[PDB]
Amino acid sequence: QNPNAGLFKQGYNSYSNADGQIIKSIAAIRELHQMCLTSMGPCGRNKIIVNHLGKIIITNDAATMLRELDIVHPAVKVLVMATEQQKIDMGDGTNLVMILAGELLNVSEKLISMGLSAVEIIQGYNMARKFTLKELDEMVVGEITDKNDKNELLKMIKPVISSKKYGSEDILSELVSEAVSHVLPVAQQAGEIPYFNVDSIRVVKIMGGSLSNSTVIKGMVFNREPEGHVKSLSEDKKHKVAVFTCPLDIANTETKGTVLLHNAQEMLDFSKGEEKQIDAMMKEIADMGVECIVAGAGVGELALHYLNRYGILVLKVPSKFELRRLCRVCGATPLPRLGAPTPEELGLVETVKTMEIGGDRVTVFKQEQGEISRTSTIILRGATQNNLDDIERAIDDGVAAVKGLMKPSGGKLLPGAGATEIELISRITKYGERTPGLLQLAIKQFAVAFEVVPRTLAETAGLDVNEVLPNLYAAHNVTEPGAVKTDHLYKGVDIDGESDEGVKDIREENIYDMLATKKFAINVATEAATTVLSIDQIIMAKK
């Protein structure tokens, strides 16, 4: 009997501002904000997601979870796209943008509760965003000069590797710095030409051992074995390397090339002809000076015997991506045909050999003095697959973060451990107090939204926020005998677990954040919050 009314478009799940849609969307986003809050910080806790393939994946990266989490509410997709943008443009801050957007939308609930309209809230958020972005430029303490030195690189490497397998930085930072130094070319008095390339660094893992057994190899390491009599090249420099696409077998002909067997003598002659053709093809390859052969397809037993007879090393690379990487390392070009390895298409690799790591043989194409390649590989070892995956993700993130040290103020360093957050909170509060009109409340709530970072750092470490946060605020909220603030203004959230109580200056650990990363994260989080708040009606359908 009870009729339905209020919907004139169609039969669907309708959300309207009259029914509190602005708060329903906020709660829907909170559904994942709660998950993302416990992920940020050095003491972040792991999450497990089961893939459709039956593989159990454990990680602390918010972006990885979002890519796998089943998200159907259209409002959350705004923050998902924000995280995707953070991952694409910046090398870090995937959790930061999510946390900031969630906190902004949460404080928007308080703003609405006071009777403020969404439009004025958005205007105040935009003004506070502009003020915060302008102020961020003044939060720089040090600057990376991009000298490619390991010690200088460690400054940025250490903070990035943190929050993933915390406590293992002593080895991960060294590995990342060594790889970056190996791949980084030598240059000076120029900032227009890019130098770092993330694609030039590859990460591999071998089961067994521990992280202490990891090492870095200058060059590209492959898990494929030669599967031939010759296991490595000689000590001569600049061995000619040939890449083939057609399988190493009897050479064919573009026109005709069809052979039919009917008689037994014909079959015997055909077998002898196949043997002779393989021998002749290998002889022709040798005559061109080819000393190493890369086969993207299968290789016959006769082909192996003949190529080993001429002292030519054969390495199988069936993976197209591995073939591309090898071609980039040595500069060789794949040959679609057999028997025509033109010198112009041949690469140069000084040393090619097979190495045993934990019982698994791997082949590395590397060099020392001549034809230096800017590619490096990081070898990880560990008895636990979950630890190996976590360390691989941490290394990947650390290597990627190096791309942010380029010309556009990439070396700027800001205080970490939330000290920058406290300073920005104070500045935004002052600006809101100065700002007239109702926008002051929006500015104050925007400032409050930045209190999450110390909150998350304290909570993830098992510390009570009610005792950590006020102490940090009191330490930052001090008056100096002068018009300019000075002294220890870099105090942040401590890892705790020792000492007695309170906060410490970050200079002991040298933890700093990137200006570009923080600015981009703030901008994207504010844009996502504005987009979410700008919607007062959502149309959803059964899925």
Binding site: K9, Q10, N17, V119, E254, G339, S534, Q537, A541
Partner: protein, 534 residues
Amino acid sequence: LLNPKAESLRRDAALKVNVTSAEGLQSVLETNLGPKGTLKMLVDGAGNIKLTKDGKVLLTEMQIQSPTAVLIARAAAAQDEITGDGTTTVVCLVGELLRQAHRFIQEGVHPRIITDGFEIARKESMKFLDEFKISKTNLSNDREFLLQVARSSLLTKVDADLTEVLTPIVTDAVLSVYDAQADNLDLHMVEIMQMQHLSPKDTTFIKGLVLDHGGRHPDMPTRVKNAYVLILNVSLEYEKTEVNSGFFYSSADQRDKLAASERKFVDAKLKKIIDLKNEVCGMDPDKGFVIINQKGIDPMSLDVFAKHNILALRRAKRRNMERLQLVTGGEAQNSVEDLSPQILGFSGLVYQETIGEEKFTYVTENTDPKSCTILIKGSTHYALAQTKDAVRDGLRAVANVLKDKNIIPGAGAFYIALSRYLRSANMNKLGAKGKTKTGIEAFAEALLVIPKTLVKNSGFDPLDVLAMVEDELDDAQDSDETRYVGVDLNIGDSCDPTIEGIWDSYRVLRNAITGATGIASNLLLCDELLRAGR
């Protein structure tokens, strides 16, 4: 008195249903009116989400169940094909007119009387529109007015931050295509392109055309200054023997020799191309050479071109070649043997842009391209769609303003002034009869919906703003002076639209008023609802 498989509305049920549907549609489109309005979120169910504010797009994409709402949306959609804007205004006017008509009908007023009153008020509003408009000058230095119009159009669709970027872009794009002459205006001369993995604020204006395909050789110059544009329809890919042949061999060396011998056909054409390049400004300073080469190019030919400091493209769309024929002035050469300098065009800086997923080429800075390109840049699909919609709306608004010099100040001044003029003149004249006063008052009150909705969206109280506007208008009338009084959605008090820079199109308002009156008359005259065909 009914038939199976059918349902009908009797007595005033049809009127009540139509009024309820109109009110529902108005409330759906009430919140998105004005720069202070909100955005609607649409989900198609396939994973694509659209965040749109334009009324036409919202009505077209959204599914409507109420037949009366469907009719209202379809009728209002005509604004897009006539003026390009005002759909939300039409919907709001229809909704308020139907509200007032239903209120009067509850008092016993026949619908036909209301329809006649609406027609009389429509005639009076047309007279007021004619008397109230402002004539725009034909000066070529009106760029400031065009900027104001573009800002007014954009502020309704953007977040007030991209306005600074889009206003100059739209103004320049519209002005370049339509010179300070009679001639004619065609928005097809302005190309719209979208790029991903870029910031929303990166949107810029390109004087000429942008080519999708880029170079495929590291040695080609990144930038070419004062380049001669060559368009070639002859393929430069590897060619085989003109007569029947093949590759029958025992070793690949014979095949390589045969391929080298056959390459002479392409080599001959490359020689002619290089000769043309050398003859025409081969070594002249501040000169370059660029070849389009619609057809494909063999890598060896690409290397040959690169070694001669020639920037050559390949595999370009025929539409791009046709556009280049005008943008650069060069001609497409069907046969290399007849190649001559007259085919070569001329263009300014030629720049190649490298993107992670693609590579673009710029052929802008032309003497008289008779066209321009706007590059919409964004990182998300919804952002790109919003930017494209805003750019198109601004282009259409500026084109309407240029073609039609009649301009009317906005900011709600027109609606309030029209309402006051009707309330005065119709009541003082009473040209049809007293019984039409109900419809006259209904129309006059309904015409005030737009300013009230704008004030409600801005967050201010409509009562106080309307009272202040009325007080200012009364003071102006008592002073015996001509003054335009509008609504300031940022301060909340009254303001002069002619000074702040808020303007509305004459055609938009005319068509919106006519459509709203027609829809209201058609719906109010519905006596009953009939169902058939089941």
